[PDB]
Design a protein around this nucleic acid. Structure first.
Lengths: 134, 46, 100
RNA sequence: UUCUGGUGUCCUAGGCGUAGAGGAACCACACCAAUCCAUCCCGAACUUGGUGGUUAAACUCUACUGCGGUGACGAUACUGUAGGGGAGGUCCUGCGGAAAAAUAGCUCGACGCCAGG
RNA sequence: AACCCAGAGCUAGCUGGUUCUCCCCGAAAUGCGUUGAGGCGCAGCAGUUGACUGGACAUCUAGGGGUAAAGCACUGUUUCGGUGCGGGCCGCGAGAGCGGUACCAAAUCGAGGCAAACUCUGAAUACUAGAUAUGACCUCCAAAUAACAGGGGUCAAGGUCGGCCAGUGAGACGAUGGGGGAUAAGCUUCAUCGUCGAGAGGGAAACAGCCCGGAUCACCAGCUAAGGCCCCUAAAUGACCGCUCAGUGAUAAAGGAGGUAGGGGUGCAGAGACAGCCAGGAGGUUUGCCUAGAAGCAGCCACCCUUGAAAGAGUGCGUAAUAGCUCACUGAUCGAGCGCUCUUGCGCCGAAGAUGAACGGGGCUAAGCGGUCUGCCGAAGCUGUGGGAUGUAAAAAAACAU
RNA sequence: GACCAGGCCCGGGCGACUGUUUACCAAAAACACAGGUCUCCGCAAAGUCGUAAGACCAUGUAUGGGGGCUGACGCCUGCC
RNA sequence: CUAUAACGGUCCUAAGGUAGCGAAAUUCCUUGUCGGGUAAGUUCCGACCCGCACGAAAGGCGUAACGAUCUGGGCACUGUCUCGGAGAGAGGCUCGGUGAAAUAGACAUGUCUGUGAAGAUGCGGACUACCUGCACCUGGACAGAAAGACCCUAUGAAGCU
RNA sequence: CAGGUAGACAGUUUCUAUGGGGCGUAGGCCUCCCAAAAGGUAACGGAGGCGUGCAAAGGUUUCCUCGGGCCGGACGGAGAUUGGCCCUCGAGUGCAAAGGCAGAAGGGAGCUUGACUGCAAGACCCACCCGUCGAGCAGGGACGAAAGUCGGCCUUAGUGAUCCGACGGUGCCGAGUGGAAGGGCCGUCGCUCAACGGAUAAAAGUUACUCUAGGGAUAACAGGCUGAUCUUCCCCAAGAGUUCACAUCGACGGGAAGGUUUGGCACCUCGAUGUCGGCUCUUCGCCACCUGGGGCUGUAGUAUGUUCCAAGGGUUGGGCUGUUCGCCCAUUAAAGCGGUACGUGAGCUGGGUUCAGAACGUCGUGAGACAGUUCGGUCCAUAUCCGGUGUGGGCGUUAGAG
């Protein structure tokens, strides 16, 4: 959602790169949501997907939110554009590159996790798929 | 919306003729066998 | 309303790299703190800069886990010279000042 | 001519730990007293002068990869040039260079001087 | 704050303008400073005259780094599990010894992630230097002809320090590396490079910056680069493999799809595999709670066994509830392929603007899109044949570079 | 009977009013005004123009002469 | 009972606005709310006072008469209008005389669409147009004027404080 | 002659980067990042400090290791002072950060004044000015027994050129000569000259009464790029709808198109592209208000709700306001939204880029001012060409005609 302490208030951007070879594996959970598409995912889509698959499981099992934002995005107001004064308490952002696991789920059967992970992939600006723990 | 139209010199890096066929880049000019050198263009006759 | 634009412009760095001819009094390293400790045939400065004492090359070698040791060696090397373009340059200077 | 022990220098830095050994000689602790000296108090430290026993502590030697340090090859990311795709974020080719991490290993240092017996 | 005359041809860091020719060379839009920002002084980069010089371009080697990548060893930050310093209440009638606890939290371990102001690491390039290496041409030459090498001659090119003497100091786009923005702008600011500026020609329909390419001049000469070969408009209605049926062929996505051409997996069949018709789909049973009824069909809890060829406390409809229609499953007739997933290639929809085909045009199912094979067209490039000028150079001729 | 020759009423704002004002885009709510108040001035006055002589004031003498503000008239004009 | 403040304390000043007025030539929110007028009224009038930011000679509140003053409403009246129509003159049109002007690089001076210094008769593709007058209309020629009064720059000028 | 003293009067100043402004902010020095692994490098990019302080916190000799957790000790507890182990550089360095520094550059003790004079080979930085380091020599010393070390501080910030003036001192000049007045030279002092390369020792505002030289380098109106904002549509479905995601809405989110609002850039135009509303008169788009056809409906019929095709045609009269928009009345099949530079002022008229006069509130000491209000306030024009509507004349239509 949002980090409590910030070492630095405002932080500039950074560009996407190739396939994340570290966060591609499955640590916990049986099923996952691997992203094929490098972009930003705010904490707002993470709340949307989290409510989506928690209320789409709704009887048993547990999900695993992998990513945390850890960088802010400063939106300048409509004040005729010259400075980056204050935009730090505005929306946070997680960098996602291809390969990276976004969500995981366990305790759920086959097609209930297919609709749980697949319906909650519609709350997201980047194309994904669901991955079994091989 | 949020899709930028490609203006001038960005239109030229996109819509220029590019021969993107790996065969037609390999083509060199044709080679005929060499011929003996032609004689003199003219000659003094006295 | 910005609280910025406080640049500094100050410069430092390695002045003479390794395997290079030094001079007596030539400033080898300008550094902040001691990235390069003074070895032999060198001297440390008032603001920890490393200058050479004698002529010769400079070298770098460890004496701990990280340290670097700028040193100076006397360099009695290389008498032979197979250079032949330069003699053609001076010889053509002679031929052009004798031709005209 | 090995050990012993003052001394260094290159060092992949060679250490922790578990084990075995050494008091002929050497090194080191221990007991007694304080005159130079000394601790913001103590001869704990330092100094002087002796009983002089031990390896107990400390040093030295030999093993182990249990930690530690070091660390591959192949790959692969990246990147220089020459290009291509995408609406963008950005990706893919030819040639050259080439990681890091991890892993297989390597490492319980190596060369010199001088005085004994 | 009148008008005329005079200072006065005031002053203007501002605007406009500044007139004949030929040849050689040729920028810059950067930094610093400025009562300065559209000015100026200096440096950078020109021209010319020198004096020292011997370098440039390729290849190799050596040095410092801390960028990209990477990583959690420091600084933070963060997801989860366990032991969890410590608290939360029931609590006892008290100076109190320690009892009650599936609940929250410092610390560590494990599995993990992220960071321009984090680094145990660490490239490629770049910078400094060292080192290796004749750049073309003509001619002689070993009894000599080839060739190797050599002798001689000619040309071309780098830099430093000056003298005199200018402009320039508004840049623009394209690739990469980033910051500001909303990783929006033909946006703004930087760093390396290419072009324009100051660059003509060809391709791009037209069109500064995109690709080829560097225009001394002539020819009613030839060969090519980029790009093209149906017609407008030069050259192939060329050849052989596949694909597209949307005129896609100019276009934008999420997502949907028995589109079509494949490719990889997995499951059933000559002891009959798929699709349709027909037969069965029952007993305890209306499992136990509720309701008037809940009989599978408003719902709650599990969600049986038996006959068997198979039947599910039911897949849906329906009824006041039943009854009942029907299906998952099995039996029977003909019979030989049928599923269900990933995946590309080209396609479809998504895809809608205001004057009128508007996407070069006509049009084409190839004249479209991918993979090769041979030729041609195609510039002011190159070559050839001839002039001119500049530099060597100091007379002419000749040569090489321009 | 042609030409000629008042349209009016009901409310409100401002200015009391008749007048004056930007010749050539503003006639007004602007200026002035009668009235009020403060303040200066004893004549060799104050004030104004002029280096000066001097002049207006004024051949007038505080019931008069300047200057500031407000604007008839009616009620008043508070505190510091 | 909901309120609201007769009343109270405190801080700071030199003093904390008196009478009267009050969404006003003053009120941003605001077309405040109510009542009148109107079929319907951001304008008008009468009120409340939450006076952004009235107020007592930079006077405040009133009023008869007055005003080419502003503004609200009503009667009569009519081409203002619905929704135009006819007629008379001076022009305009034609002929004869006289006869300019602003403007003007040369003009063999189409439409769409696209491109381009981002609004093209002039460049590209297509379509459409025999040449050339006369009478009307003015959409374009970024039409004419006139070195933008607005904006900014000038180490400009000037007035005023 | 001297003091005081009125913008009554005179000459002047009143910065710049910027958002091209009231309302702000900054101007000079240092550290990290941006900064793309040499150095450099910009933005009103992200974070901080500095305008000093120390008689030791300088010099030298010598000694020592901190910091944190645990355990012990009726004051004293979690934590003071003391003892012991563990981790070994995480502490500290006058203060911001960076790089350093573990038998230290960190802490203590002794003696101390090199926090000297005269210098200085060579380097770095380099527009210039500057600024930084320095072996080595002489004098005279400090510490140490000596070796050696010391020309301030672990380093980088803690500052300011010049002209002039002042103090201390001197074997210098002394306008005929001897002096003196005065001036040098040396050592230092005096600027928040902080707009910090400093204009002068000394300087604020307004102009709507304005004026000139310029600029599209630079705003407004309009066009262009962008699409944050707005309009429209679509993907998923937790729900609401007696049951029931998808008759109808659809939360949390996501993907597009358009260029009609407000914005961003400043690319054409200021030697002139005339904004807002109304009248007249077009034409065009569909994101459909009605008319025509249809699907679905929680559609019994009437009337619907939503949606598909379809832009041929229509889309009223009025009270308020300058009004666009909007409210209200009477209705109507319905009283659509927009493009065409307000679509349209070389066709026409009011509020306004609120022009010159005046008044109210408020601000200002004042001149004056308000994206506050009110009253009054000149708007030109004979069509050259294209374009249009009408109407001819010539020629052509292959002999000439009706």
């Amino acid at each position: 959602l949002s980090p409590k302490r910030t070492r630095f208030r405002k932080q500039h951007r950074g560009r996407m790169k190739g396939i994340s070879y570290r966060g591609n594996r499955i640590c916990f959970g049986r099923y996952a949501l691997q992203a094929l598409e490098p972009a930003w995912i705010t904490s707002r889509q993470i709340e949307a997907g989290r409510r989506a698959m928690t209320r789409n499981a709704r009887r048993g099992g547990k999900i695993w939110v992998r990513i945390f934002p850890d960088k802010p995005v400063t939106v300048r107001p409509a004040e005729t554009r010259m400075g980056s004064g204050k935009g730090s308490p505005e929306y946070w952002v997680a960098v996602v590159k291809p390969g990276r696991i976004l969500y995981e789920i366990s305790g759920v059967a086959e097609n209930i996790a297919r609709r749980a992970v697949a319906i909650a992939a519609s709350k997201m600006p980047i194309r994904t798929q669901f991955i079994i723990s091989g | 919306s949020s899709r930028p139209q490609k203006k001038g010199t960005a239109h030229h890096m996109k819509t220029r003729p590019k021969k993107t066929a790996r065969w037609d880049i390999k083509r060199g000019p044709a080679v005929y066998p060499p011929l003996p050198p032609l004689p003199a263009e003219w000659t003094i006759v006295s | 309303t910005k609280n910025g634009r406080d640049s500094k412009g100050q410069r430092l760095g390695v002045k003479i790299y390794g395997d290079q001819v030094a001079k007596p009094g030539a400033i080898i390293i300008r550094q902040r703190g001691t990235k390069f400790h003074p070895g032999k045939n060198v001297g440390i400065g008032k603001d920890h800069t490393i200058f050479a004492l004698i002529d010769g090359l400079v070298k770098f070698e460890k004496y701990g886990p990280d340290k670097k040791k700028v040193s100076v060696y006397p360099r009695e090397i290389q008498p032979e010279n197979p250079n032949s373009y330069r003699a053609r340059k001076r010889e053509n200077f002679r031929l052009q000042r004798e031709k005209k």
